[PDB]
Write a protein that holds these residues in place. Structure first.
Motif, PDB file in Angstrom:
ATOM      1  N   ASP A   1     -28.216  23.522  21.209  1.00  0.00           N
ATOM      2  CA  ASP A   1     -27.329  22.574  21.855  1.00  0.00           C
ATOM      3  C   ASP A   1     -26.368  23.342  22.749  1.00  0.00           C
ATOM      4  O   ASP A   1     -26.124  24.533  22.553  1.00  0.00           O
ATOM      5  N   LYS A   2     -25.823  22.642  23.735  1.00  0.00           N
ATOM      6  CA  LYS A   2     -24.990  23.259  24.750  1.00  0.00           C
ATOM      7  C   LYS A   2     -23.568  22.727  24.675  1.00  0.00           C
ATOM      8  O   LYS A   2     -23.327  21.595  24.243  1.00  0.00           O
ATOM      9  N   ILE A   3     -22.627  23.561  25.106  1.00  0.00           N
ATOM     10  CA  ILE A   3     -21.214  23.214  25.146  1.00  0.00           C
ATOM     11  C   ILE A   3     -20.804  23.060  26.602  1.00  0.00           C
ATOM     12  O   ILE A   3     -21.309  23.776  27.476  1.00  0.00           O
ATOM     13  N   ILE A   4     -19.892  22.128  26.867  1.00  0.00           N
ATOM     14  CA  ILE A   4     -19.508  21.800  28.235  1.00  0.00           C
ATOM     15  C   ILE A   4     -18.089  22.272  28.521  1.00  0.00           C
ATOM     16  O   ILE A   4     -17.843  22.960  29.517  1.00  0.00           O
ATOM     17  N   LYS A   5     -17.145  21.911  27.652  1.00  0.00           N
ATOM     18  CA  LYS A   5     -15.738  22.256  27.860  1.00  0.00           C
ATOM     19  C   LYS A   5     -15.442  23.590  27.176  1.00  0.00           C
ATOM     20  O   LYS A   5     -14.706  23.682  26.193  1.00  0.00           O
ATOM     21  N   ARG A   6     -16.046  24.643  27.728  1.00  0.00           N
ATOM     22  CA  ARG A   6     -15.880  25.973  27.153  1.00  0.00           C
ATOM     23  C   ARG A   6     -14.417  26.365  27.049  1.00  0.00           C
ATOM     24  O   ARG A   6     -14.029  27.062  26.104  1.00  0.00           O
ATOM     25  N   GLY A   7     -13.594  25.935  27.999  1.00  0.00           N
ATOM     26  CA  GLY A   7     -12.180  26.248  27.926  1.00  0.00           C
ATOM     27  C   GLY A   7     -11.528  25.704  26.675  1.00  0.00           C
ATOM     28  O   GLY A   7     -10.505  26.223  26.226  1.00  0.00           O
ATOM     29  N   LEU A   8     -12.101  24.655  26.100  1.00  0.00           N
ATOM     30  CA  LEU A   8     -11.606  24.074  24.865  1.00  0.00           C
ATOM     31  C   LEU A   8     -11.972  24.890  23.634  1.00  0.00           C
ATOM     32  O   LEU A   8     -11.491  24.575  22.540  1.00  0.00           O
ATOM     33  N   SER A   9     -12.810  25.911  23.779  1.00  0.00           N
ATOM     34  CA  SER A   9     -13.290  26.718  22.666  1.00  0.00           C
ATOM     35  C   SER A   9     -12.763  28.133  22.813  1.00  0.00           C
ATOM     36  O   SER A   9     -12.890  28.739  23.882  1.00  0.00           O
ATOM     37  N   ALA A  10     -12.180  28.659  21.738  1.00  0.00           N
ATOM     38  CA  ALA A  10     -11.608  29.997  21.780  1.00  0.00           C
ATOM     39  C   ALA A  10     -12.674  31.077  21.710  1.00  0.00           C
ATOM     40  O   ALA A  10     -12.520  32.134  22.331  1.00  0.00           O
ATOM     41  N   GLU A  11     -13.747  30.832  20.965  1.00  0.00           N
ATOM     42  CA  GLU A  11     -14.734  31.875  20.717  1.00  0.00           C
ATOM     43  C   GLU A  11     -15.355  32.371  22.019  1.00  0.00           C
ATOM     44  O   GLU A  11     -15.476  33.584  22.246  1.00  0.00           O
TER      45      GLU A  11
ATOM     46  N   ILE B   1      -5.921  28.312  21.070  1.00  0.00           N
ATOM     47  CA  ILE B   1      -5.783  27.249  22.057  1.00  0.00           C
ATOM     48  C   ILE B   1      -5.354  25.977  21.346  1.00  0.00           C
ATOM     49  O   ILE B   1      -5.867  25.657  20.270  1.00  0.00           O
ATOM     50  N   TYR B   2      -4.435  25.245  21.963  1.00  0.00           N
ATOM     51  CA  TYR B   2      -3.874  24.028  21.399  1.00  0.00           C
ATOM     52  C   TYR B   2      -4.246  22.843  22.278  1.00  0.00           C
ATOM     53  O   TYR B   2      -3.898  22.814  23.462  1.00  0.00           O
ATOM     54  N   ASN B   3      -4.940  21.867  21.696  1.00  0.00           N
ATOM     55  CA  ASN B   3      -5.381  20.677  22.419  1.00  0.00           C
ATOM     56  C   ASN B   3      -5.091  19.442  21.577  1.00  0.00           C
ATOM     57  O   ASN B   3      -5.838  19.147  20.629  1.00  0.00           O
TER      58      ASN B   3
END
Lengths: 85, 103, 32, 103, 209, 105
Positions: free
Chosen positions: E92-102, E191-193
Motif C-alpha cells: 500500500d502507498k502513502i500520500i501525505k508523507r509530510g504527515l508521517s515522521a518516519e 510532528i503535531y497534527n
C-alpha cells in the motif's frame, strides 16, 4: 576402547536409563533436531536467552516470552503492551 | 446439516471487537444465531524497572495487555458446513481479530 | 604429534597379481 | 575430443587420483574403465593395474596432463584460464560414469 | 464450571503472532529503507497469511516482474515454518508523507550521510511538513557535531503538545541513529497534527452566533 | 571444516529453489531441520550448523549472497552474480530460472 568392559556388579550400578531432565530451551524448530565431538558441548543445560538480544540474564519466561527487560521497553508498543494506570 | 458450531473471537482493542460483533449479529439474524457471552477479561501484567541500571530512586513501569473475548456458538443446526462461509464473508474483515470456528 | 610413514608399493604383497590381501595385532582397516 | 563430459562428471565427480584410491576402486568398486598415465613413474606401478584389469575393462592413452585437465586437479582462476602446472594424475578410474561418441 | 486451560490455547495463539509482527517490522526497517518503509500490518487468516505494507513508493520494492517481492515471500516461509505461496504480501502507498515522521527522518538521515549541513536539511524537512499541512514540527540533533565536546541543538517552528493522552494520537515521534566517523549522531523528530481523521482535541470550544 | 560435497550441493539447490536462506545464529551442535540430503548416510539426513555457517560465510564474503541480520536470525539473499554461479555447479543451463521468478501462486 570399543572392546572394553567391567565387572557386571560394576555395571548394574550405572545411572537411571531415563535420559536427563536437562534439555536446552528451543523456541522453534529452527534451532536443532536433537574427536572433539565427544565432549564439545556434552554439558547439557538450559540456555534460554532473549530472542532479541541473546542474553541469559533477566529473561521474562512469564507467558512464554523469553524477552530481556531492557530489550522489552522498546518493543512493548509494537507487541501491544501499553503504559496506563 | 446440523453440527453444533462455536465461534471464538479474540482481540486487544475494544472498538473493533465491538464492531465485528454488530456486523456478524446483524448478518446472522436469519440463520438463528444469538448474541455473545462476554467473557472475563484476561489481564497480562508486567512490572519492570524504568532504568537499564540501578540508580537514583527506584521507579517502576506498569505495562499490561487486555484481551477481550466474545463467543457465539448459537449457529449449530441453523447453519450447515457451507452456510458458515456465508456468514464469515459479508462481515467487514479487520486486519487483527482472529476468529476461530469449531463444532 | 606422530608423523606419517612414506607410502610405497605395498601391493606387491603378490608377486604377480595373485590377489592376496584386498601388521602387529589383527586389526581391521579402521575399527578392528 | 573427450574433454567436456568429464567436466560434467566432475561437478558430480566420478574420477579419482592416487594409487590408494584406484586400487580400492579397482577392487570392490564399479570400475568401468580408466585412461591411464601410460607407464610414467614405473610400468610395474601400472603393471599392477594392467595385470589386475586383464585378470579382473580399461585401456591406455598417452595424455597425463589432459588427465589433469578434465580432472579438476589444476588451479583454475575465476577467469577460466590456466594458472598452475596441470597436475599429472594416473589413478584414472571412473565410477558413477553419468565415449559412446568414441565407440 | 469451565476449564481455564483451554482458552489459554487461544490466548497464547494470539500472543505468538504479535511477536511475529514485530520481528518483521525490524527486518523491514533494516531492509526496505529505499522504498520508504513506514509500517507493517498482518491479517492472520486460517488459509494463509496476508501482509499489508506501507511504503511511500511500492513500485521500487515491488520489483520488475515482482521478482524481489516474490523472493521475499519465500524467505519468510523458511523462518516461520509456513508453506510458501501462502505468505501473500500486499503493498500500500502513502500520500501525505509530510504527515508521517518516519519517512522524513529517513530522508534526513540520507541527507546527513552525504555530509549535507544539518541546518539546511532540518529546515527543508520542516518546510516540507508545513507544506503538507502541519501545525508544528520539531527536530533535534545530538552528538559530536564539530568538536570533541558534545552538545545538542534543536530546531522547530510552531506549537507542539507534550502532555496528556492526546500525545498518544496527534503526536507522532520517531528517532534514528547515525554511525559517522567521529561517532554516533542521534536524531529525532515529532510532528503535531490536530485534524487527523477528523478527531477534535479537547479544551477546544466553537460557538455560533 | 571437512564438509562433504553432498552438503554443498544440497545447500546450493535449496538456495536456487527458494533463492533464500533464513538461517539461525547458532554455534553449538545441532541439525538444521530444513535442508536435507541422502548420500552415504543412506537416508535423507540433516546437516550440522557449523558446516552450513562456514559455507554461507564464504558465499557472503565472495559477494554471491548478502545478509540482513535483524534479531537472532540471518537472512541471506542471492544476487544476479550468484544466479550466474550456482547455475554452473549444479550443471544448470542459462534458460533454467529460480522458482520465485515465476508466480508463487
Amino acid at each position: 576402547r570399543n572392546l572394553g568392559s567391567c565387572g557386571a556388579e560394576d555395571l548394574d550400578s550405572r545411572v537411571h536409563p531415563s535420559t536427563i531432565f536437562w534439555p536446552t530451551e528451543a523456541d522453534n524448530i529452527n534451532l536443532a533436531s536433537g574427536m572433539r565431538e565427544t565432549e564439545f558441548c556434552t554439558h547439557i543445560a538450559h540456555k534460554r536467552e532473549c530472542r532479541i538480544c541473546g542474553n541469559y540474564n533477566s529473561v521474562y519466561r512469564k507467558y512464554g516470552l523469553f524477552i530481556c527487560r531492557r530489550c522489552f521497553k522498546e518493543n512493548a508498543g509494537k507487541i501491544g503492551f501499553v503504559k496506563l494506570h | 446439516m446440523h453440527q453444533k458450531y462455536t465461534i471464538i473471537v479474540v482481540g486487544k482493542d475494544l472498538k473493533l471487537v465491538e464492531r465485528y460483533v454488530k456486523s456478524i449479529v446483524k448478518e446472522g439474524r436469519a440463520f438463528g444465531i444469538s448474541g455473545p457471552c462476554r467473557a472475563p477479561v484476561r489481564r497480562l501484567t508486567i512490572t519492570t524497572r524504568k532504568s537499564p541500571c540501578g540508580e537514583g530512586t527506584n521507579t517502576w513501569h506498569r505495562f499490561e495487555l487486555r484481551m477481550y473475548k466474545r463467543t457465539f456458538w448459537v449457529t449449530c443446526g441453523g447453519n450447515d458446513i457451507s452456510t458458515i462461509l456465508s456468514k464469515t464473508v459479508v462481515i467487514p474483515g479487520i486486519q487483527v481479530t482472529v476468529e476461530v470456528e469449531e463444532p | 604429534e606422530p608423523k606419517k610413514v612414506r607410502l610405497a608399493c605395498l601391493k606387491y604383497y603378490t608377486i604377480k597379481g595373485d590377489t592376496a590381501e584386498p601388521a602387529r595385532h589383527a586389526d581391521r582397516c579402521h575399527c578392528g | 575430443f573427450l574433454k567436456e563430459t568429464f567436466k560434467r562428471i566432475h561437478n558430480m565427480d566420478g574420477l579419482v587420483t592416487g594409487h590408494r584410491q584406484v586400487f580400492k576402486y579397482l577392487e570392490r568398486k564399479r570400475a568401468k574403465i580408466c585412461f591411464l598415465a601410460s607407464d610414467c613413474e614405473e610400468k610395474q606401478y601400472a603393471d599392477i593395474v594392467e595385470c589386475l584389469c586383464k585378470e579382473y575393462h580399461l585401456c591406455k592413452k598417452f595424455t597425463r596432463r589432459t588427465l589433469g585437465e578434465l580432472t579438476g586437479q589444476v588451479r583454475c582462476l575465476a577467469d577460466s584460464d590456466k594458472i598452475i602446472k596441470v597436475v599429472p594424475a594416473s589413478a584414472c578410474v571412473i565410477h558413477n560414469f553419468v565415449d559412446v561418441d568414441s565407440f | 464450571i469451565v476449564r481455564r486451560d483451554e482458552e489459554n490455547v487461544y490466548y497464547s495463539k494470539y500472543l505468538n503472532d504479535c511477536i511475529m509482527e514485530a520481528e518483521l517490522h525490524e527486518f523491514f526497517s533494516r531492509e526496505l529503507v529505499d522504498a520508504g518503509y513506514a509500517s507493517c500490518s498482518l491479517c492472520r487468516t486460517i488459509d494463509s497469511i496476508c501482509v499489508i505494507i506501507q511504503c511511500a513508493e511500492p513500485e521500487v520494492v515491488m520489483g520488475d516482474n515482482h521478482y524481489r517481492l516474490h523472493k521475499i515471500e519465500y524467505l519468510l516461509a523458511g523462518r516461520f515454518m509456513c508453506d510458501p505461496k501462502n505468505f501473500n504480501i500486499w503493498v500500500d502507498k502513502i500520500i501525505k508523507r509530510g504527515l508521517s515522521a518516519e519517512i522524513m527522518v529517513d530522508n534526513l538521515r540520507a541527507k546527513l550521510e552525504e555530509a549535507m549541513p544539518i541546518r539546511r536539511a532540518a529546515y527543508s524537512i520542516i518546510r516540507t511538513a508545513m507544506r503538507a499541512g502541519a501545525a508544528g514540527c520539531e527536530v533535534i540533533v545530538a552528538g559530536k557535531l564539530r568538536a570533541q565536546r558534545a552538545r545538542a541543538n534543536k530546531f522547530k517552528e510552531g506549537c507542539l503538545i507534550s502532555t496528556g493522552h492526546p500525545k498518544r494520537i496527534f503526536l507522532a515521534e520517531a528517532t534514528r541513529h547515525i554511525k559517522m566517523r567521529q561517532g554516533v549522531i542521534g536524531v529525532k523528530v515529532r510532528i503535531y497534527n490536530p485534524n487527523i481523521r477528523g478527531a477534535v482535541m479537547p479544551d477546544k470550544i466553537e460557538i455560533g452566533a | 571444516v571437512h564438509i562433504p560435497k553432498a552438503v554443498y550441493k544440497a545447500v546450493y539447490a535449496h538456495l536456487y529453489e527458494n533463492a533464500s536462506l533464513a538461517l539461525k545464529e547458532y554455534w553449538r551442535v545441532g541439525n538444521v531441520p530444513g535442508i536435507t540430503y541422502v548420500d552415504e548416510n543412506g537416508k535423507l539426513c540433516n546437516p550440522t550448523y557449523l558446516h552450513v555457517n562456514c559455507i554461507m560465510q564464504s558465499l557472503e564474503s565472495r559477494g554471491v549472497v548478502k545478509d540482513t541480520f535483524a534479531w537472532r536470525h540471518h537472512y541471506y539473499l542471492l544476487t544476479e552474480k550468484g544466479e550466474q554461479f550456482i547455475r554452473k555447479e549444479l550443471d544448470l543451463t542459462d534458460d533454467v530460472l529460480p522458482t520465485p521468478y515465476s508466480k508463487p501462486s
